[PDB]
Design an enzyme around this catalytic site. Structure first.
Site, short mmCIF file in Angstrom:
data_model
loop_
_atom_site.label_atom_id
_atom_site.label_comp_id
_atom_site.label_asym_id
_atom_site.label_seq_id
_atom_site.Cartn_x
_atom_site.Cartn_y
_atom_site.Cartn_z
N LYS A 106 -2.18 6.07 -4.52
CA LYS A 106 -3.31 6.95 -4.24
C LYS A 106 -3.11 8.34 -4.84
O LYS A 106 -2.00 8.86 -4.89
CB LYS A 106 -3.54 7.09 -2.73
CG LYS A 106 -3.50 5.76 -1.98
CD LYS A 106 -3.96 5.92 -0.54
CE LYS A 106 -3.71 4.62 0.25
NZ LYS A 106 -2.27 4.45 0.59
N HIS A 162 -7.38 9.44 -2.34
CA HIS A 162 -6.79 9.35 -1.00
C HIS A 162 -7.75 9.88 0.07
O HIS A 162 -7.88 9.27 1.14
CB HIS A 162 -5.46 10.10 -0.97
CG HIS A 162 -4.52 9.66 0.11
ND1 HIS A 162 -3.15 9.61 -0.07
CD2 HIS A 162 -4.74 9.26 1.39
CE1 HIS A 162 -2.57 9.19 1.04
NE2 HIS A 162 -3.52 8.97 1.94
N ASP A 165 0.85 -1.18 0.00
CA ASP A 165 0.00 0.00 0.00
C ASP A 165 0.89 1.23 0.00
O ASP A 165 1.59 1.49 0.98
CB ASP A 165 -0.93 0.03 1.21
CG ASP A 165 -1.89 1.21 1.16
OD1 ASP A 165 -2.85 1.14 0.37
OD2 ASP A 165 -1.67 2.20 1.88
N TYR A 173 3.09 9.91 0.30
CA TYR A 173 4.04 9.37 1.26
C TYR A 173 5.48 9.73 0.88
O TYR A 173 6.38 9.50 1.68
CB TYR A 173 3.91 7.85 1.39
CG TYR A 173 2.55 7.36 1.84
CD1 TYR A 173 1.63 8.22 2.43
CD2 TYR A 173 2.18 6.03 1.65
CE1 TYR A 173 0.38 7.77 2.82
CE2 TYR A 173 0.94 5.57 2.04
CZ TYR A 173 0.05 6.44 2.62
OH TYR A 173 -1.19 5.97 3.00
#
Ligand SMILES: NC(=O)c1ccc[n+]([C@@H]2O[C@H](COP(=O)([O-])OP(=O)(O)OC[C@H]3O[C@@H](n4cnc5c(N)ncnc54)[C@H](OP(=O)(O)O)[C@@H]3O)[C@@H](O)[C@H]2O)c1
Ligand SMILES: NC(=O)c1ccc[n+]([C@@H]2O[C@H](COP(=O)([O-])OP(=O)(O)OC[C@H]3O[C@@H](n4cnc5c(N)ncnc54)[C@H](OP(=O)(O)O)[C@@H]3O)[C@@H](O)[C@H]2O)c1
Ligand SMILES: O=C(O)[C@@H](O)[C@@H](O)[C@H](O)[C@H](O)CO
Ligand SMILES: O=C(O)[C@@H](O)[C@@H](O)[C@H](O)[C@H](O)CO
Lengths: 309, 309
Positions: B76, B107, B42, B47
């Protein structure tokens, strides 16, 4: 006093809500409220008392108590009518004996199984869970609300119980921006972020459950009433006003519209008498410490779904 | 063990999340995970480690450690790219060095000011409040997500952090139904109503924050970690499994997909070793008691807006 909506119309900052009014008493209560000075009334198709409300307004007009253009009348599209907006609004107008509404709101960002025009119902499946409608978008419903303005049936349109995410979405897809978001807010559920978001984009805030629901919501939902809080009793002693009047004045000074309900004419007059004093900055700052971020009103039990999950 | 999505594709019920993995360690952790047997990963553009993830996967493919087709890779769309969907997806594909994604998620049900392709950010105004976008509806973003499937860039598309109201709305306007709703859920935030609703309409649930965030979320968000709970201590003694393993097995037996993160290879092994035991009906009812309806992860501080207000 009154707030000017982004539609151009002025909306009185103190109104009377009619949810849970005894249906045999609404006529006397509404006529008494009008006589006392109430001009803003918060109604809904799913309160199932629009007929009695309409009879009250008709008698107030017939007896020269008030004129239609002096009233600000709100009603609401129920969840079961998200696919039948024009018919539902016209039915509300018929029951209320009105030619136009001042404000018409989407009652919840929830569509459920249609139960017939004039007969709103939250239909449960055989497992006790709401029959949710997954065919009608909130945007589609809104574009039909926009036609009500274009047809002259409604002056201003808006929403109820929309959070930050849903409010951002309608701001994105609307052609006519919503004039009002009617949300639960009171000293234990102050919701600064959502009020400030709505205000940033010109959406007025009506505070439903503005007292916190008092004993009625304690019994129905298990919520804690703020009205006996020591903060409010100190302010009540100092201002020679009841805790409820302090709370309503607080809502007004937050630049929100407050719609308390009472079934007692003595409290109707009390709740309206909040324009002869003011709360100081320090008073407001004390009420701010009351914040619990605790919702009182939830349809989770009635609908068999915790929509706030 | 995998769940068959409504798109027809199988998605492994245990994956590895990479949020807050140090960029100097991701590539070793991912290669370790793949050697252990992890196949579901994931990721997210925001990130800020897609590049290092793609480098790890590239080395895994070049050394015949695994084949692309046996990996399930999620990333995402950040809030800043709701108006640049296809271009943001292609950028994720390029950083990850992939030709297709198994899963691409919105997201958040939030759009904010665009910050450039490949450079996602939550732009704040001068008062520290998110520059919220009010031009791109969630439906508009979804219809671009649907193009990614037709273009062959994405096998399955879904959403993240959508509540009951937002999920009902996308069920209404979507032509390709969302395959996944990735939401926070764990023993202290069990969200039965939302999971039930999503499952009713064939949407898979991925549990992010599936351990409750442990000590990382206590520090970052102030949440209480469930891993010390007396209930899990007793179940740990019963099964000779760690509280964490109990919690992940519980997620699997709720028919959800669980994506725990660890920066420790021994914990990577521990978290994947949950298919050699089962929780009894009584075990799951004991974990049901831990429900406190308490969210751990919230972007309120990062965005200057309590979106859950
Ligand atoms: N859009 C929505 O989803 C939504 C949801 C909830 C409510 N609303 C609207 O908002 C209106 C107000 O909310 P609400 O009726 O739920 O709760 P509320 O106005 O916050 O409080 C009502 C309760 O407070 C008591 N009360 C009223 N005035 C008082 C006073 N001066 N001193 C002490 N107690 C007092 C009433 O008792 P008595 O009647 O015995 O005086 C009643 O039990 C509703 O009528 C409805 O129109 C809308
Ligand atoms: N869509 C969203 O908005 C969203 C939000 C949050 C998270 N996510 C995704 O979900 C993934 C998981 O969520 P999360 O990482 O925030 O929280 P989490 O997986 O519930 O817990 C992570 C924390 O638990 C610790 N931990 C891991 N395994 C453990 C074990 N066996 N025993 C004790 N402690 C253990 C980790 O520490 P160590 O690393 O030191 O081992 C880390 O501090 C993320 O990586 C991200 O991919 C998505
Ligand atoms: O006052 C309101 O508008 C809410 O409390 C509704 O959920 C109301 O309870 C229903 O319309 C009653 O059927
Ligand atoms: O893990 C997640 O997806 C969330 O915690 C995000 O809010 C995350 O904090 C941000 O994307 C990081 O920039």
């Amino acid at each position: 006093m009154a707030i000017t909506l982004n539609s151009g119309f002025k909306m009185p900052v103190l109104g009377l809500g009619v949810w849970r009014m005894d249906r045999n008493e609404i006529k006397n209560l509404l006529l008494s409220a009008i006589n006392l000075g109430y001009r803003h009334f918060d109604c809904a198709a799913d309160y199932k008392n629009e007929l009695e409300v309409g009879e009250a307004f008709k008698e107030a007009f017939d007896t020269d108590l008030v004129k239609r253009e002096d009233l600000f009348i709100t009603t609401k599209l129920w969840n079961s009518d998200h696919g039948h907006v024009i018919e539902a609004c016209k039915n509300s107008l018929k029951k209320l004996q009105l030619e136009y509404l001042d404000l018409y709101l989407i009652h919840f960002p929830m569509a459920s199984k249609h139960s017939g025009i004039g007969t709103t119902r939250s239909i449960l499946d055989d497992e006790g869970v709401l029959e949710v409608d997954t065919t009608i978008s909130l945007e589609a419903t809104w574009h039909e609300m926009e036609k009500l303005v274009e047809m002259g049936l409604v002056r201003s349109i808006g929403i109820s119980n929309y959070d930050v995410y849903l409010t951002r979405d309608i701001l994105s897809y609307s052609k006519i921006k919503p004039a009002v978001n009617q949300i639960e807010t009171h000293p234990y559920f102050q919701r600064d972020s959502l009020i400030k978001f709505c205000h940033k984009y010109g959406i007025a805030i009506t505070a439903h459950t503005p007292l916190g629901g008092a004993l009625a919501n304690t019994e129905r939902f298990g919520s804690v009433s703020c009205l006996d809080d020591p903060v409010l009793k100190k302010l009540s002693d100092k201002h020679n006003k009841s805790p409820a009047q302090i709370v309503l004045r607080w809502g007004v000074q937050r630049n929100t519209i407050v719609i308390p309900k009472s079934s007692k004419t003595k409290r109707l007059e009390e709740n309206l008498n909040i324009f002869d004093f003011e709360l100081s900055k320090e008073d407001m700052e004390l009420i701010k410490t009351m914040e619990r971020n605790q919702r009182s009103n939830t349809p989770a039990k009635a609908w068999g779904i915790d929509v706030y999950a």
